MMTF fields as JSON, N, C-alpha, C and O atoms, coordinates in Angstrom:
{
  "mmtfVersion": "1.0.0",
  "mmtfProducer": "UNKNOWN",
  "numBonds": 551,
  "numAtoms": 552,
  "numGroups": 138,
  "numChains": 1,
  "numModels": 1,
  "chainsPerModel": [1],
  "groupsPerChain": [138],
  "chainIdList": ["A"],
  "bondAtomList": [4, 2, 8, 6, 12, 10, 16, 14, 20, 18, 24, 22, 28, 26, 32, 30, 36, 34, 40, 38, 44, 42, 48, 46, 52, 50, 56, 54, 60, 58, 64, 62, 68, 66, 72, 70, 76, 74, 80, 78, 84, 82, 88, 86, 92, 90, 96, 94, 100, 98, 104, 102, 108, 106, 112, 110, 116, 114, 120, 118, 124, 122, 128, 126, 132, 130, 136, 134, 140, 138, 144, 142, 148, 146, 152, 150, 156, 154, 160, 158, 164, 162, 168, 166, 172, 170, 176, 174, 180, 178, 184, 182, 188, 186, 192, 190, 196, 194, 200, 198, 204, 202, 208, 206, 212, 210, 216, 214, 220, 218, 224, 222, 228, 226, 232, 230, 236, 234, 240, 238, 244, 242, 248, 246, 252, 250, 256, 254, 260, 258, 264, 262, 268, 266, 272, 270, 276, 274, 280, 278, 284, 282, 288, 286, 292, 290, 296, 294, 300, 298, 304, 302, 308, 306, 312, 310, 316, 314, 320, 318, 324, 322, 328, 326, 332, 330, 336, 334, 340, 338, 344, 342, 348, 346, 352, 350, 356, 354, 360, 358, 364, 362, 368, 366, 372, 370, 376, 374, 380, 378, 384, 382, 388, 386, 392, 390, 396, 394, 400, 398, 404, 402, 408, 406, 412, 410, 416, 414, 420, 418, 424, 422, 428, 426, 432, 430, 436, 434, 440, 438, 444, 442, 448, 446, 452, 450, 456, 454, 460, 458, 464, 462, 468, 466, 472, 470, 476, 474, 480, 478, 484, 482, 488, 486, 492, 490, 496, 494, 500, 498, 504, 502, 508, 506, 512, 510, 516, 514, 520, 518, 524, 522, 528, 526, 532, 530, 536, 534, 540, 538, 544, 542, 548, 546],
  "bondOrderList": [1, 1, 1, 1, 1, 1, 1, 1, 1, 1, 1, 1, 1, 1, 1, 1, 1, 1, 1, 1, 1, 1, 1, 1, 1, 1, 1, 1, 1, 1, 1, 1, 1, 1, 1, 1, 1, 1, 1, 1, 1, 1, 1, 1, 1, 1, 1, 1, 1, 1, 1, 1, 1, 1, 1, 1, 1, 1, 1, 1, 1, 1, 1, 1, 1, 1, 1, 1, 1, 1, 1, 1, 1, 1, 1, 1, 1, 1, 1, 1, 1, 1, 1, 1, 1, 1, 1, 1, 1, 1, 1, 1, 1, 1, 1, 1, 1, 1, 1, 1, 1, 1, 1, 1, 1, 1, 1, 1, 1, 1, 1, 1, 1, 1, 1, 1, 1, 1, 1, 1, 1, 1, 1, 1, 1, 1, 1, 1, 1, 1, 1, 1, 1, 1, 1, 1, 1],
  "groupList": [{"groupName": "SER", "atomNameList": ["N", "CA", "C", "O"], "elementList": ["N", "C", "C", "O"], "formalChargeList": [0, 0, 0, 0], "bondAtomList": [1, 0, 2, 1, 3, 2], "bondOrderList": [1, 1, 2], "singleLetterCode": "S", "chemCompType": "L-PEPTIDE LINKING"}, {"groupName": "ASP", "atomNameList": ["N", "CA", "C", "O"], "elementList": ["N", "C", "C", "O"], "formalChargeList": [0, 0, 0, 0], "bondAtomList": [1, 0, 2, 1, 3, 2], "bondOrderList": [1, 1, 2], "singleLetterCode": "D", "chemCompType": "L-PEPTIDE LINKING"}, {"groupName": "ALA", "atomNameList": ["N", "CA", "C", "O"], "elementList": ["N", "C", "C", "O"], "formalChargeList": [0, 0, 0, 0], "bondAtomList": [1, 0, 2, 1, 3, 2], "bondOrderList": [1, 1, 2], "singleLetterCode": "A", "chemCompType": "L-PEPTIDE LINKING"}, {"groupName": "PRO", "atomNameList": ["N", "CA", "C", "O"], "elementList": ["N", "C", "C", "O"], "formalChargeList": [0, 0, 0, 0], "bondAtomList": [1, 0, 2, 1, 3, 2], "bondOrderList": [1, 1, 2], "singleLetterCode": "P", "chemCompType": "L-PEPTIDE LINKING"}, {"groupName": "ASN", "atomNameList": ["N", "CA", "C", "O"], "elementList": ["N", "C", "C", "O"], "formalChargeList": [0, 0, 0, 0], "bondAtomList": [1, 0, 2, 1, 3, 2], "bondOrderList": [1, 1, 2], "singleLetterCode": "N", "chemCompType": "L-PEPTIDE LINKING"}, {"groupName": "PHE", "atomNameList": ["N", "CA", "C", "O"], "elementList": ["N", "C", "C", "O"], "formalChargeList": [0, 0, 0, 0], "bondAtomList": [1, 0, 2, 1, 3, 2], "bondOrderList": [1, 1, 2], "singleLetterCode": "F", "chemCompType": "L-PEPTIDE LINKING"}, {"groupName": "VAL", "atomNameList": ["N", "CA", "C", "O"], "elementList": ["N", "C", "C", "O"], "formalChargeList": [0, 0, 0, 0], "bondAtomList": [1, 0, 2, 1, 3, 2], "bondOrderList": [1, 1, 2], "singleLetterCode": "V", "chemCompType": "L-PEPTIDE LINKING"}, {"groupName": "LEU", "atomNameList": ["N", "CA", "C", "O"], "elementList": ["N", "C", "C", "O"], "formalChargeList": [0, 0, 0, 0], "bondAtomList": [1, 0, 2, 1, 3, 2], "bondOrderList": [1, 1, 2], "singleLetterCode": "L", "chemCompType": "L-PEPTIDE LINKING"}, {"groupName": "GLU", "atomNameList": ["N", "CA", "C", "O"], "elementList": ["N", "C", "C", "O"], "formalChargeList": [0, 0, 0, 0], "bondAtomList": [1, 0, 2, 1, 3, 2], "bondOrderList": [1, 1, 2], "singleLetterCode": "E", "chemCompType": "L-PEPTIDE LINKING"}, {"groupName": "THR", "atomNameList": ["N", "CA", "C", "O"], "elementList": ["N", "C", "C", "O"], "formalChargeList": [0, 0, 0, 0], "bondAtomList": [1, 0, 2, 1, 3, 2], "bondOrderList": [1, 1, 2], "singleLetterCode": "T", "chemCompType": "L-PEPTIDE LINKING"}, {"groupName": "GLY", "atomNameList": ["N", "CA", "C", "O"], "elementList": ["N", "C", "C", "O"], "formalChargeList": [0, 0, 0, 0], "bondAtomList": [1, 0, 2, 1, 3, 2], "bondOrderList": [1, 1, 2], "singleLetterCode": "G", "chemCompType": "PEPTIDE LINKING"}, {"groupName": "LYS", "atomNameList": ["N", "CA", "C", "O"], "elementList": ["N", "C", "C", "O"], "formalChargeList": [0, 0, 0, 0], "bondAtomList": [1, 0, 2, 1, 3, 2], "bondOrderList": [1, 1, 2], "singleLetterCode": "K", "chemCompType": "L-PEPTIDE LINKING"}, {"groupName": "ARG", "atomNameList": ["N", "CA", "C", "O"], "elementList": ["N", "C", "C", "O"], "formalChargeList": [0, 0, 0, 0], "bondAtomList": [1, 0, 2, 1, 3, 2], "bondOrderList": [1, 1, 2], "singleLetterCode": "R", "chemCompType": "L-PEPTIDE LINKING"}, {"groupName": "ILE", "atomNameList": ["N", "CA", "C", "O"], "elementList": ["N", "C", "C", "O"], "formalChargeList": [0, 0, 0, 0], "bondAtomList": [1, 0, 2, 1, 3, 2], "bondOrderList": [1, 1, 2], "singleLetterCode": "I", "chemCompType": "L-PEPTIDE LINKING"}, {"groupName": "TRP", "atomNameList": ["N", "CA", "C", "O"], "elementList": ["N", "C", "C", "O"], "formalChargeList": [0, 0, 0, 0], "bondAtomList": [1, 0, 2, 1, 3, 2], "bondOrderList": [1, 1, 2], "singleLetterCode": "W", "chemCompType": "L-PEPTIDE LINKING"}, {"groupName": "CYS", "atomNameList": ["N", "CA", "C", "O"], "elementList": ["N", "C", "C", "O"], "formalChargeList": [0, 0, 0, 0], "bondAtomList": [1, 0, 2, 1, 3, 2], "bondOrderList": [1, 1, 2], "singleLetterCode": "C", "chemCompType": "L-PEPTIDE LINKING"}, {"groupName": "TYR", "atomNameList": ["N", "CA", "C", "O"], "elementList": ["N", "C", "C", "O"], "formalChargeList": [0, 0, 0, 0], "bondAtomList": [1, 0, 2, 1, 3, 2], "bondOrderList": [1, 1, 2], "singleLetterCode": "Y", "chemCompType": "L-PEPTIDE LINKING"}, {"groupName": "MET", "atomNameList": ["N", "CA", "C", "O"], "elementList": ["N", "C", "C", "O"], "formalChargeList": [0, 0, 0, 0], "bondAtomList": [1, 0, 2, 1, 3, 2], "bondOrderList": [1, 1, 2], "singleLetterCode": "M", "chemCompType": "L-PEPTIDE LINKING"}, {"groupName": "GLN", "atomNameList": ["N", "CA", "C", "O"], "elementList": ["N", "C", "C", "O"], "formalChargeList": [0, 0, 0, 0], "bondAtomList": [1, 0, 2, 1, 3, 2], "bondOrderList": [1, 1, 2], "singleLetterCode": "Q", "chemCompType": "L-PEPTIDE LINKING"}, {"groupName": "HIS", "atomNameList": ["N", "CA", "C", "O"], "elementList": ["N", "C", "C", "O"], "formalChargeList": [0, 0, 0, 0], "bondAtomList": [1, 0, 2, 1, 3, 2], "bondOrderList": [1, 1, 2], "singleLetterCode": "H", "chemCompType": "L-PEPTIDE LINKING"}],
  "groupTypeList": [0, 1, 2, 3, 4, 5, 6, 7, 8, 1, 9, 4, 10, 11, 12, 13, 8, 7, 0, 1, 7, 11, 10, 11, 10, 6, 5, 7, 4, 5, 14, 10, 9, 14, 15, 8, 3, 2, 11, 11, 8, 5, 3, 16, 17, 2, 4, 18, 16, 11, 19, 5, 11, 0, 18, 10, 6, 8, 13, 6, 2, 6, 4, 6, 10, 8, 0, 11, 13, 2, 6, 19, 4, 5, 17, 11, 0, 16, 10, 6, 4, 5, 3, 6, 6, 7, 1, 9, 1, 12, 18, 6, 7, 1, 2, 16, 1, 6, 0, 3, 7, 3, 9, 9, 5, 7, 13, 4, 3, 8, 10, 11, 6, 6, 11, 6, 6, 9, 10, 9, 17, 9, 8, 0, 17, 13, 19, 1, 16, 17, 4, 7, 13, 11, 3, 10, 8, 9],
  "groupIdList": [1, 2, 3, 4, 5, 6, 7, 8, 9, 10, 11, 12, 13, 14, 15, 16, 17, 18, 19, 20, 21, 22, 23, 24, 25, 26, 27, 28, 29, 30, 31, 32, 33, 34, 35, 36, 37, 38, 39, 40, 41, 42, 43, 44, 45, 46, 47, 48, 49, 50, 51, 52, 53, 54, 55, 56, 57, 58, 59, 60, 61, 62, 63, 64, 65, 66, 67, 68, 69, 70, 71, 72, 73, 74, 75, 76, 77, 78, 79, 80, 81, 82, 83, 84, 85, 86, 87, 88, 89, 90, 91, 92, 93, 94, 95, 96, 97, 98, 99, 100, 101, 102, 103, 104, 105, 106, 107, 108, 109, 110, 111, 112, 113, 114, 115, 116, 117, 118, 119, 120, 121, 122, 123, 124, 125, 126, 127, 128, 129, 130, 131, 132, 133, 134, 135, 136, 137, 138],
  "secStructList": [7, 5, 7, 7, 7, 7, 3, 3, 3, 5, 6, 6, 1, 7, 3, 3, 3, 4, 4, 4, 4, 6, 6, 1, 3, 3, 3, 3, 3, 3, 3, 7, 6, 6, 7, 2, 2, 2, 2, 2, 2, 2, 2, 2, 2, 2, 2, 2, 2, 2, 2, 2, 4, 4, 4, 6, 3, 3, 3, 3, 3, 3, 3, 3, 1, 7, 7, 2, 2, 2, 2, 2, 2, 2, 2, 2, 2, 6, 6, 7, 7, 1, 7, 3, 3, 3, 3, 6, 6, 1, 2, 2, 2, 2, 2, 6, 6, 7, 7, 1, 1, 1, 3, 3, 3, 3, 3, 7, 6, 6, 1, 5, 3, 3, 3, 3, 3, 3, 1, 7, 7, 7, 2, 2, 2, 2, 2, 2, 2, 2, 2, 2, 2, 7, 1, 1, 7, 7],
  "xCoordList": [86.006, 85.124, 85.664, 86.705, 84.934, 85.26, 85.501, 84.767, 86.534, 86.784, 85.84, 85.827, 85.051, 84.187, 84.962, 85.978, 84.47, 85.091, 84.758, 83.716, 85.642, 85.458, 86.326, 87.312, 85.952, 86.775, 87.042, 86.107, 88.306, 88.704, 89.845, 90.54, 90.022, 91.164, 92.378, 92.265, 93.539, 94.791, 95.217, 94.584, 96.29, 96.699, 97.229, 97.44, 97.446, 97.755, 96.579, 96.743, 95.365, 94.138, 93.789, 92.823, 94.58, 94.359, 93.318, 93.398, 92.348, 91.328, 91.959, 92.669, 91.675, 92.126, 90.896, 90.109, 90.713, 89.637, 90.248, 91.18, 89.709, 90.349, 90.479, 91.536, 89.381, 89.343, 90.428, 90.835, 90.893, 91.993, 93.32, 94.265, 93.392, 94.599, 94.581, 95.459, 93.608, 93.609, 94.923, 95.548, 95.31, 96.618, 97.74, 98.774, 97.523, 98.48, 97.923, 96.711, 98.802, 98.347, 98.127, 98.886, 97.092, 96.785, 96.762, 96.035, 97.601, 97.688, 96.82, 97.293, 95.567, 94.547, 94.419, 93.85, 94.959, 95.101, 94.188, 94.26, 93.336, 92.541, 93.2, 93.596, 93.325, 94.093, 93.592, 92.876, 93.995, 93.855, 95.093, 95.872, 95.275, 96.428, 96.389, 97.389, 95.247, 95.127, 95.574, 95.481, 96.055, 96.529, 98.002, 98.824, 98.349, 99.745, 100.486, 101.631, 99.856, 100.493, 100.928, 101.983, 100.127, 100.479, 101.796, 102.497, 102.115, 103.375, 104.564, 105.671, 104.31, 105.327, 105.255, 106.263, 104.016, 103.75, 103.963, 104.366, 103.699, 103.866, 105.351, 105.587, 106.345, 107.757, 108.088, 108.79, 107.606, 107.739, 107.141, 107.778, 105.912, 105.27, 106.08, 106.321, 106.508, 107.363, 108.627, 109.028, 109.257, 110.527, 110.379, 111.212, 109.274, 108.918, 108.487, 108.762, 107.812, 107.377, 108.509, 108.372, 109.628, 110.861, 111.214, 111.7, 110.97, 111.117, 109.868, 109.974, 108.685, 107.534, 106.818, 106.036, 107.077, 106.514, 106.926, 106.106, 108.177, 108.694, 108.428, 108.886, 107.676, 107.167, 105.644, 105.002, 105.088, 103.691, 102.715, 101.537, 103.205, 102.332, 102.057, 102.988, 100.82, 100.463, 99.911, 99.19, 100.258, 99.587, 98.536, 98.773, 97.378, 96.383, 96.034, 95.365, 96.492, 96.298, 95.215, 95.419, 94.023, 92.83, 92.719, 92.447, 92.929, 92.709, 91.213, 90.426, 90.852, 89.447, 88.988, 89.118, 88.455, 87.741, 88.526, 87.927, 89.844, 90.607, 90.933, 90.788, 91.365, 91.591, 92.847, 93.71, 92.961, 94.123, 95.386, 96.442, 95.307, 96.461, 96.97, 98.175, 96.073, 96.426, 97.0, 97.918, 96.483, 97.041, 98.446, 99.359, 98.633, 99.959, 100.96, 102.095, 100.53, 101.43, 101.942, 103.131, 101.035, 101.366, 102.284, 103.233, 102.02, 102.792, 104.259, 105.186, 104.43, 105.758, 106.503, 107.71, 105.786, 106.394, 106.853, 107.825, 106.142, 106.39, 106.991, 106.97, 107.501, 108.228, 107.404, 107.899, 106.128, 105.264, 105.816, 106.169, 105.883, 106.38, 105.384, 105.726, 104.162, 103.192, 101.839, 101.624, 100.937, 99.659, 98.728, 98.475, 98.235, 97.299, 96.081, 96.217, 94.893, 93.646, 92.764, 92.929, 91.838, 91.039, 89.585, 88.815, 89.225, 87.852, 87.145, 86.885, 86.841, 86.477, 85.219, 85.121, 84.246, 82.954, 82.771, 81.673, 83.89, 83.945, 83.13, 82.894, 82.69, 81.814, 82.532, 81.927, 83.836, 84.616, 84.863, 84.755, 85.197, 85.38, 84.093, 84.154, 82.934, 81.565, 81.274, 80.725, 81.626, 81.406, 82.207, 81.77, 83.379, 84.268, 83.936, 84.533, 82.97, 82.499, 83.679, 83.845, 84.476, 85.713, 85.427, 84.967, 85.702, 85.568, 86.954, 87.28, 87.781, 89.065, 90.112, 90.313, 90.763, 91.815, 93.195, 93.294, 94.26, 94.24, 93.701, 93.78, 93.146, 92.767, 93.315, 93.237, 93.867, 94.344, 93.649, 93.513, 93.212, 92.754, 93.817, 94.321, 94.148, 95.16, 94.386, 93.659, 94.578, 93.745, 94.647, 95.702, 94.227, 95.061, 94.94, 94.097, 95.821, 95.748, 94.397, 94.039, 93.666, 92.316, 91.229, 90.084, 91.599, 90.71, 89.854, 88.806, 90.307, 89.598, 90.368, 91.597, 89.626, 90.275, 90.754, 89.97, 92.037, 92.614, 92.863, 92.979, 92.939, 93.155, 92.74, 92.957, 92.14, 91.877, 92.709, 92.696, 93.445, 94.371, 94.016, 93.893, 93.856, 93.693, 94.788, 95.404, 95.018, 96.06, 97.414, 97.529, 98.43, 99.713, 100.414, 100.286, 101.148, 101.967, 103.42, 103.771, 104.266, 105.687, 106.143, 105.391, 107.351, 107.835, 107.919, 107.745, 108.184, 108.288, 106.935, 106.858, 105.894, 104.535, 104.139, 103.611, 104.413, 104.243, 104.982, 104.396, 106.237, 106.99, 106.237, 106.08, 105.782, 105.142, 103.758, 103.38, 103.017, 101.729, 101.895, 101.1, 102.892, 103.192, 103.609, 103.225, 104.376, 104.811, 103.593, 103.548, 102.629, 101.365, 100.665, 100.196, 100.579, 99.75, 100.482, 99.829, 101.791, 102.479, 102.134, 102.057, 101.925, 101.574, 102.628, 102.277, 103.9, 104.899, 105.972, 105.695, 107.215, 108.428, 109.095, 109.276, 109.457, 109.932, 111.356, 111.956],
  "yCoordList": [101.297, 101.937, 101.786, 102.344, 101.024, 100.813, 102.134, 103.105, 102.149, 103.355, 103.275, 102.262, 104.332, 104.328, 104.02, 104.653, 103.038, 102.692, 103.724, 104.378, 103.851, 104.777, 104.36, 103.643, 104.818, 104.651, 106.047, 106.795, 106.373, 107.581, 107.281, 106.273, 108.156, 108.094, 108.824, 109.923, 108.204, 108.867, 109.801, 109.823, 110.579, 111.607, 111.059, 111.819, 109.746, 109.074, 108.389, 107.663, 108.611, 108.025, 106.597, 105.999, 106.08, 104.769, 104.763, 105.542, 103.871, 103.631, 103.092, 102.086, 103.792, 103.383, 103.135, 104.055, 101.922, 101.572, 101.339, 100.549, 102.04, 101.985, 100.521, 100.126, 99.756, 98.381, 97.515, 96.489, 97.913, 97.235, 97.318, 96.597, 98.187, 98.364, 97.619, 97.832, 96.758, 95.98, 95.203, 94.809, 95.002, 94.356, 95.406, 95.151, 96.572, 97.687, 98.704, 98.792, 99.459, 100.628, 101.742, 101.882, 102.54, 103.627, 104.974, 105.183, 105.871, 107.249, 108.097, 108.554, 108.278, 108.851, 110.372, 110.765, 111.179, 112.607, 113.436, 113.309, 114.277, 115.192, 116.561, 117.074, 117.169, 118.421, 119.218, 118.699, 120.495, 121.307, 122.184, 122.335, 122.764, 123.655, 124.95, 125.663, 125.25, 126.403, 126.137, 127.019, 124.921, 124.562, 124.857, 124.06, 125.996, 126.364, 125.262, 124.959, 124.643, 123.48, 122.342, 121.742, 122.044, 121.025, 121.316, 120.393, 122.585, 122.966, 122.571, 122.351, 122.488, 122.016, 120.472, 119.765, 120.006, 118.609, 117.634, 116.494, 118.064, 117.159, 116.688, 115.495, 117.62, 117.175, 116.229, 115.239, 116.506, 115.598, 114.224, 113.203, 114.195, 112.955, 112.202, 111.006, 112.873, 112.292, 111.68, 110.581, 112.4, 111.976, 110.714, 109.807, 110.694, 109.535, 108.304, 107.161, 108.574, 107.53, 106.752, 105.549, 107.396, 106.704, 105.508, 104.494, 105.625, 104.504, 103.61, 102.385, 104.229, 103.455, 102.719, 101.803, 103.107, 102.362, 100.87, 99.981, 100.62, 99.246, 98.546, 97.425, 99.226, 98.682, 98.4, 98.066, 98.53, 98.25, 99.35, 99.086, 100.616, 101.811, 102.41, 102.615, 102.681, 103.434, 104.835, 104.975, 105.839, 107.182, 107.256, 106.881, 107.753, 108.168, 109.587, 109.85, 110.522, 111.931, 112.449, 112.655, 112.67, 112.979, 114.48, 115.22, 114.923, 116.321, 116.65, 115.951, 117.747, 118.148, 119.128, 120.346, 118.539, 119.274, 120.228, 121.131, 120.061, 120.944, 120.256, 119.04, 121.027, 120.524, 119.721, 119.827, 118.897, 118.021, 118.895, 118.527, 120.013, 120.909, 121.541, 121.554, 122.057, 122.681, 121.626, 121.926, 120.384, 119.315, 118.964, 118.853, 118.788, 118.461, 119.552, 119.271, 120.791, 121.941, 121.821, 121.992, 121.533, 121.452, 120.255, 120.374, 119.106, 117.902, 118.112, 117.669, 118.804, 119.122, 120.169, 120.05, 121.185, 122.231, 121.703, 122.196, 120.697, 120.183, 118.742, 118.12, 118.256, 116.967, 115.802, 114.971, 115.727, 114.539, 113.302, 113.341, 112.207, 110.959, 109.822, 108.641, 110.207, 109.256, 109.404, 110.383, 108.413, 108.519, 109.655, 109.898, 110.332, 111.455, 111.13, 110.785, 111.248, 110.997, 112.255, 113.162, 112.29, 113.51, 113.308, 112.606, 113.931, 113.951, 115.135, 116.158, 114.98, 116.118, 116.846, 118.063, 116.104, 116.648, 116.677, 116.894, 116.45, 116.48, 115.401, 115.512, 114.351, 113.346, 112.49, 112.026, 112.284, 111.51, 112.312, 111.793, 113.587, 114.539, 114.544, 114.448, 114.659, 114.62, 113.312, 113.337, 112.171, 110.838, 110.666, 109.973, 111.283, 111.231, 112.352, 112.455, 113.19, 114.315, 115.238, 115.585, 115.612, 116.33, 117.844, 118.294, 118.594, 120.078, 120.766, 121.478, 120.555, 121.289, 120.578, 119.371, 121.3, 120.807, 121.4, 122.6, 120.595, 119.177, 118.374, 118.797, 117.195, 116.208, 114.84, 114.484, 114.066, 112.749, 111.648, 111.739, 110.601, 109.376, 108.279, 107.922, 107.753, 106.674, 105.355, 105.086, 104.547, 103.361, 102.118, 102.027, 101.179, 99.992, 98.951, 99.087, 97.888, 96.857, 96.118, 95.505, 96.2, 95.623, 96.542, 96.124, 97.775, 98.683, 99.521, 100.031, 99.662, 100.43, 101.738, 101.776, 102.785, 104.079, 103.965, 103.635, 104.23, 104.138, 105.536, 105.681, 106.547, 107.913, 108.887, 108.633, 110.008, 111.133, 112.308, 112.676, 112.894, 113.989, 115.26, 115.266, 116.343, 117.657, 118.561, 118.224, 119.697, 120.571, 120.206, 119.272, 120.943, 120.741, 119.45, 119.026, 118.851, 117.686, 118.015, 118.445, 117.822, 117.874, 116.598, 115.625, 116.588, 115.368, 114.222, 113.054, 114.569, 113.618, 112.888, 111.669, 113.723, 113.22, 112.288, 111.195, 112.758, 111.933, 110.539, 109.499, 110.556, 109.338, 108.39, 107.201, 108.941, 108.143, 107.609, 106.49, 108.428, 107.993, 106.857, 105.917, 106.914, 105.823, 104.559, 103.444, 104.746, 103.649, 102.963, 101.741, 103.779, 103.322, 102.337, 101.299, 102.643, 101.843, 100.773, 99.983, 100.743, 99.781, 98.349, 98.079, 97.423, 95.971, 95.047, 94.029, 95.361, 94.434, 95.044, 95.847, 94.638, 95.4, 94.667, 93.451, 95.374, 94.67, 95.046, 94.544],
  "zCoordList": [125.701, 124.682, 123.251, 122.905, 122.433, 121.004, 120.24, 120.418, 119.395, 118.617, 117.404, 116.704, 117.149, 115.983, 114.698, 114.411, 113.926, 112.678, 111.572, 111.617, 110.609, 109.512, 108.353, 108.525, 107.154, 105.97, 105.354, 105.068, 105.16, 104.484, 103.475, 103.602, 102.491, 101.588, 102.134, 102.677, 101.986, 102.355, 101.228, 100.172, 101.441, 100.465, 99.149, 98.203, 99.075, 97.805, 97.164, 96.184, 97.711, 97.203, 97.659, 97.185, 98.571, 99.164, 100.287, 101.237, 100.151, 101.152, 102.469, 102.468, 103.575, 104.925, 105.778, 106.003, 106.255, 107.17, 108.553, 108.703, 109.568, 110.872, 111.437, 111.929, 111.345, 111.854, 111.143, 111.688, 109.951, 109.262, 110.028, 109.709, 111.027, 111.814, 113.138, 113.974, 113.344, 114.571, 114.706, 113.721, 115.964, 116.272, 116.392, 117.009, 115.8, 115.968, 116.969, 117.161, 117.595, 118.367, 117.375, 116.416, 117.594, 116.614, 117.35, 118.321, 116.824, 117.259, 116.276, 115.236, 116.649, 115.753, 116.074, 117.092, 115.182, 115.441, 114.522, 113.299, 115.108, 114.259, 114.235, 115.282, 113.037, 112.915, 111.697, 110.841, 111.655, 110.448, 110.293, 111.233, 109.103, 108.853, 109.681, 109.76, 110.293, 111.218, 112.669, 113.522, 112.933, 114.241, 114.324, 113.872, 114.897, 115.09, 115.87, 115.536, 116.918, 117.555, 116.597, 116.801, 115.562, 114.557, 113.807, 113.392, 113.642, 113.081, 113.955, 113.464, 115.253, 116.229, 116.347, 116.316, 116.483, 116.834, 115.688, 115.918, 114.452, 113.326, 113.132, 112.942, 113.179, 113.216, 114.389, 114.184, 115.596, 116.746, 116.46, 116.718, 115.925, 115.517, 114.491, 114.655, 113.435, 112.408, 113.0, 112.617, 113.942, 114.553, 115.432, 115.397, 116.228, 117.03, 116.208, 116.576, 115.101, 114.168, 113.562, 113.339, 113.284, 112.875, 113.743, 113.243, 115.034, 115.978, 116.107, 116.052, 116.28, 116.689, 115.536, 115.788, 114.292, 113.151, 113.238, 113.009, 113.565, 113.677, 115.015, 115.237, 115.911, 117.179, 117.06, 118.056, 115.882, 115.599, 115.943, 116.185, 115.968, 116.153, 114.763, 113.985, 114.459, 113.253, 113.64, 114.628, 112.858, 112.976, 111.863, 110.715, 112.256, 111.253, 111.595, 112.594, 110.753, 111.028, 110.146, 108.949, 110.743, 110.016, 109.823, 110.769, 108.596, 108.24, 108.174, 107.536, 108.864, 109.051, 107.926, 108.044, 106.851, 105.786, 104.886, 104.302, 104.753, 103.882, 102.563, 102.436, 101.6, 100.236, 100.174, 101.045, 99.125, 99.021, 98.857, 99.372, 98.17, 97.967, 99.249, 99.5, 100.051, 101.318, 102.248, 103.011, 102.21, 103.05, 102.584, 103.403, 101.265, 100.738, 101.081, 101.466, 100.939, 101.245, 102.706, 102.972, 103.616, 105.036, 105.298, 106.074, 104.667, 104.9, 104.487, 105.164, 103.352, 102.772, 103.632, 103.841, 104.125, 104.922, 106.281, 106.853, 106.787, 108.105, 108.194, 109.257, 107.102, 107.09, 107.587, 108.348, 107.158, 107.443, 106.741, 105.563, 107.491, 106.988, 107.364, 107.301, 107.75, 108.281, 107.529, 106.814, 107.708, 107.003, 107.419, 108.599, 106.393, 106.525, 105.65, 104.476, 106.246, 105.533, 105.501, 106.317, 104.557, 104.308, 104.756, 104.1, 105.878, 106.38, 105.706, 106.339, 104.426, 103.563, 103.999, 103.846, 104.546, 104.921, 106.454, 106.966, 107.158, 108.631, 109.346, 110.549, 108.623, 109.245, 110.277, 111.244, 110.064, 111.066, 112.339, 113.449, 112.154, 113.264, 114.129, 115.354, 113.457, 114.072, 114.797, 115.898, 114.21, 114.873, 116.133, 117.052, 116.204, 117.386, 118.368, 119.44, 117.981, 118.777, 119.182, 120.351, 118.182, 118.423, 118.269, 117.219, 119.308, 119.278, 119.272, 118.322, 120.342, 120.314, 119.397, 119.533, 118.486, 117.627, 117.928, 118.187, 117.902, 117.613, 118.783, 119.936, 118.464, 119.477, 119.066, 117.89, 120.002, 119.698, 120.504, 121.724, 119.784, 120.411, 120.373, 119.309, 121.554, 121.65, 121.734, 122.69, 120.685, 120.494, 120.663, 120.037, 121.503, 121.645, 120.503, 119.617, 120.545, 119.526, 119.479, 118.474, 120.595, 120.678, 120.06, 119.89, 119.734, 118.996, 119.931, 119.536, 121.178, 122.176, 122.424, 122.356, 122.708, 123.083, 124.498, 125.388, 124.741, 126.064, 126.689, 127.906, 125.812, 126.299, 125.21, 124.025, 125.615, 124.711, 125.186, 126.361, 124.224, 124.51, 123.748, 122.523, 124.52, 123.951, 124.538, 125.549, 123.901, 124.438, 123.857, 123.064, 124.255, 123.628, 124.091, 125.24, 123.164, 123.452, 123.193, 122.094, 124.181, 123.962, 123.233, 123.179, 122.679, 122.058, 123.093, 122.747, 124.346, 125.421, 125.644, 125.795, 125.652, 125.775, 124.612, 124.82, 123.387, 122.173, 122.281, 121.982, 122.703, 122.925, 123.888, 123.608, 125.015, 126.087, 125.649, 125.994, 124.887, 124.303, 123.304, 123.315, 122.451, 121.55, 122.342, 121.987, 123.385, 124.251, 124.903, 125.048, 125.283, 125.871, 124.974, 125.443, 123.659, 122.755, 121.908, 121.226, 121.946, 121.067, 121.51, 122.709, 120.544, 120.728, 121.308, 121.905, 121.156, 121.691, 122.572, 123.464, 122.296, 122.389, 121.231, 121.297, 120.19, 119.051, 118.778, 117.827]
}
């Protein structure tokens, strides 16, 4: 199943188009600052990304309708080191038909969804999910 394409701005104002990431595995995470699990999971994600960025895994962490200030505050408080984009009007959340937050779509280098994850993720689970979608062994 093809992952719905979208264009959003990242927290530095850079245009990110999902299809631009083909050839990489994509860890597509929907979240808000009201997700107490994200306070746990974002540091885990950041920590795993130190390894998986150079294995061809990209994170796209889609913030669901919050202001740039509230998103920046959260990224700083929780040591985010990965791309975060602003779904300001929730249209991307709606296209993915996402209800429970956080929700993660694991997308392969071919641009297909291989797994949808809801509920809590341990750092071990995050490691294995990234391993699932990485394009090589680099």
